[PDB]
Amino acid sequence: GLAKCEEEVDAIEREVELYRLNKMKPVYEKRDAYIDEIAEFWKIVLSQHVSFANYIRASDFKYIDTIDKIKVEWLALESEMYDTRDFSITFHFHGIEGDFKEQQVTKVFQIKKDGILTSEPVPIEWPQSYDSINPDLIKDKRSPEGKKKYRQGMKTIFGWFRWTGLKPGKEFPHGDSLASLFSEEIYPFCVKYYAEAQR
Amino acid sequence: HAKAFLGLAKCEEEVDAIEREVELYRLNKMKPVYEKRDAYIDEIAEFWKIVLSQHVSFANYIRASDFKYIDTIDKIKVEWLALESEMYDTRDFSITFHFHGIEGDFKEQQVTKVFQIKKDGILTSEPVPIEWPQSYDSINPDLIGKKKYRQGMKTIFGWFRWTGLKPGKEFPHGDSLASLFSEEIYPFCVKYYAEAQR
């Protein structure tokens, strides 16, 4: 009786989350089309954002300034095997010539069991300037200076592309909160942030 | 360049329309399920008594002497007003209580209180008649020194006259209690009853 009603409620909640996603999809497509015509749109938006700067390092800003595209996509539209909170984030970096490669990178975030957000590492080519803090390059990671170099690079935005949520205290700090920042604020409300930077 | 900005403004209109559309969609789907659920609940003896004692913060809103009267609730129904008319916010709702009553002290009675957004905007209400317990005669605003008035105004019966329009003058956190019923207690009552089983 009451148990069967409770299952119906969970069925209904997904149905409406799915209803929203399907309706929002074409609207985001149109919106992003306009966005692709505005020059420093994403640069302006990520500088305007209150909380975002706290997550990343100050030297990351020259590289995140080169972001000319952000695209969040909700995976529950792909399959009923995905939680409605599951999403991919696609970044395009224009790059910095002779330092940071022009590249497109997609990171996928999904619930594992309320459950927690997890991800997998995705390849991104680090800036040349970051060579000394590059975890794939640093030779002595246990040497006094090496430990601090490693830790510094793991705290950059490029460290976050390595984040999984499955190694507490070994990864980019609050990689999950940063992800939700994109899916819940930055990507949905970017236009509000751009108009705020306008006024 | 301003033509793009124009399209963005239209997109944000489209997003606001869509979000109300999905809210209405959820309310239409939930209504019949609640009805079926509540028919089973009506078969369970002290369901609401159990649920209201189980809830963490509910008791913090009301006086200790109120509990004997809230023990007599055998029906709580919440109905979302946006299903009536598109003139209501999707946050708008009425809440209907049935009190079994206490012989010689408290009448058996059914009371409906309506909550609605006025301008984000705030939750507001109008006073609804409720027959106070006769134990409360000395703290009944219709019977009253100003120590007693504030004591009655802090009871669950003071909440029934809460409006949200006289800040600092009414039942304290009447909006929070309202939102407790519509967002936690009524939606998730079966979960509270089940948590009381284990």
- Residue reference for tokens 């080169």: A66
Q: Can you tell me whether residue B125 is helix, strand or coil?
A: strand
Radius of gyration of chain A (CA): 19
Are the C-beta atoms of A149 and A131 separated by less than 8 Å? no
End-to-end CA distance of chain B: 63
- Nearest neighbour of A31 by CB, restricted to B8, B18, B29: B8
Q: How far apart are CA B52 and CA B38, in angstroms?
A: 16
Distances (CA, A) of A30 to A131, A198, B10: 39, 21, 10
Are the C-beta atoms of A174 and A155 separated by less than 8 Å? no
Phi/psi of residue A170, nearest 5 degrees: -115, -5
- Nearest neighbour of B11 by CB, restricted to A15, A31, A37: A31
Give the pair of three-digit tokens for residue B169: 């003058």
Ranges of each domain in chain B: 1-198
| Sign of the torsion angle spanned by Cα atoms B14, B4, A93, A192 | negative
Neighbours of B112 (CB within 10 A): 11
Closest-CA distance, A34 to chain B, in angstroms, reads: 5
- Which residues of chain A make contact with B18, given a CB cutoff of 8 A? 20, 23-24, 27
Contact A27 B37 (CB under 8 A): no
Distances (CA, A) of A159 to A53, A150, A171, B30, B87: 15, 10, 7, 44, 50
B76 forms beta bridges with B97
Q: At what angle do helices A2-35 and A190-198 cross, to 10 degrees?
A: 40
* DSSP code, position B86: T
At A95, which amino acid appears? G
Q: Can you tell me whether residue B133 is helix, strand or coil?
A: coil
- Residue reference for tokens 């300034």: A65
Query: What is the number of residues in chain A?
Result: 199
Q: Can you tell me whether residue B72 is helix, strand or coil?
A: coil
Q: How far apart are CA B157 and CA B172, in angstroms?
A: 12
Give the pair of three-digit tokens for residue B182: 């519509």
B124 forms beta bridges with B116
Nearest alpha-carbon partner for A60 in A144, A193, A178, A141: A178
Q: How far apart are CA B143 and CA B141, in angstroms?
A: 5
Q: How far apart are CA A3 and CA A66, in angstroms?
A: 52
- Nearest neighbour of B25 by CB, restricted to A2, A19, A31: A19
Surface-to-core class of residue B158, CB atoms within 10 Å of its CB (0-12 exposed, 13-18 middle, 19+ buried) = buried
Q: Can you tell me whether residue B57 is helix, strand or coil?
A: coil
Judge whether B31 is closer than 8 Å to chain A, CB to CB.
no
Contact B33 A8 (CB under 8 A): yes
Q: How far apart are CA B107 and CA A64, in angstroms?
A: 67
End-to-end CA distance of chain A: 56
Give the pair of three-digit tokens for residue A7: 């299952």
* Cα nearest neighbour of B25 on chain A: A16
Radius of gyration of chain B (CA): 20
Contact B40 A6 (CB under 8 A): no
- Which residues of chain A make contact with B21, given a CB cutoff of 8 A? 23
Phi/psi of residue A88, nearest 5 degrees: -105, 150
Judge whether A30 is closer than 8 Å to chain B, CB to CB.
yes
Contact B4 A31 (CB under 8 A): no
Q: Can you tell me whether residue B142 is helix, strand or coil?
A: coil
Give the pair of three-digit tokens for residue A19: 């209803």
Phi/psi of residue B140, nearest 5 degrees: -85, 115
Nearest alpha-carbon partner for A187 in A1, A24, A58, A9: A24
| Experimental technique of record | X-ray
Give the pair of three-digit tokens for residue B133: 């317990």
Give the pair of three-digit tokens for residue B11: 């997109």
Taking every pair of Cα atoms in chain B, the longest distance, rounded to a whole number of angstroms, is 76
- Residues contacting residue A76 through CB under 8 Å, at least 6 positions apart: A14, A17, A18, A21, A82, A83, A84, A86
Instruction: Pick the residue of A5, A40, A194 with the most B CBs within 10 A to test the interface with B by mutation.
Output: A5
Nearest alpha-carbon partner for B130 in B154, B97, B104: B97
Are the C-beta atoms of A55 and A174 separated by less than 8 Å? yes
Q: How far apart are CA A13 and CA A31, in angstroms?
A: 26
- Which residues of chain B make contact with A2, given a CB cutoff of 8 A? 37, 40-41, 190
Please tell me the number of Cα atoms within 13 Å of A35 on its side-chain side: 27
Surface-to-core class of residue A135, CB atoms within 10 Å of its CB (0-12 exposed, 13-18 middle, 19+ buried) = middle
A69 forms beta bridges with A92
Are the C-beta atoms of A64 and A77 separated by less than 8 Å? no
Neighbours of A108 (CB within 10 A): 17
B122 forms beta bridges with B118
Q: Would residue B26 be called left, alpha or beta, if left means φ above 0 and alpha means ψ between -120 and 50 degrees?
A: alpha
Q: What is the SS3 assignment for chain A? A: CHHHHHHHHHHHHHHHHHHHHHHHHHHHHHHHHHHCCCCCHHHHHHHHCCCHHHHCCHHHHHHHCCEEEEEEEEHHHCCCCCCCCCEEEEEEECCECCCECCEEEEEEEEEECCCEEEECCCCCCCCHHHHHHCCCCCCCCCCHHHHHHHHHHHCCHHHHCCCCCCCCCCCCCCHHHHHHHHHHHHCCCHHHHHHHHHC
Angle at B141 between CA B137 and CA B146, to 5 degrees: 100
Closest-CA distance, A133 to chain B, in angstroms, reads: 40
Give the pair of three-digit tokens for residue B82: 């946006």
